[PDB]
Amino acid sequence: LWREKINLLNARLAEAQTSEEQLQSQLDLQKKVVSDHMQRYLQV
């Protein structure tokens, strides 16, 4: 029963971690986009 519970929570935790990492990637890409649009706002 512990192995069953462990496998279920493993799957759930893995999917949650993937979603959280995607959120962080989007946030950092937003920061990079801020920097890039600021440089464009300066140099074009």
């Binding site: 920097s35 600021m38 440089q39 300066l42």
Partner: peptide, 10 residues
């Protein structure tokens, strides 16, 4: 590093 570039860097 003009003031605008300094604002961007900061």
């Amino acid at each position: 590093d003009s003031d605008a570039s300094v604002a961007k860097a900061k």
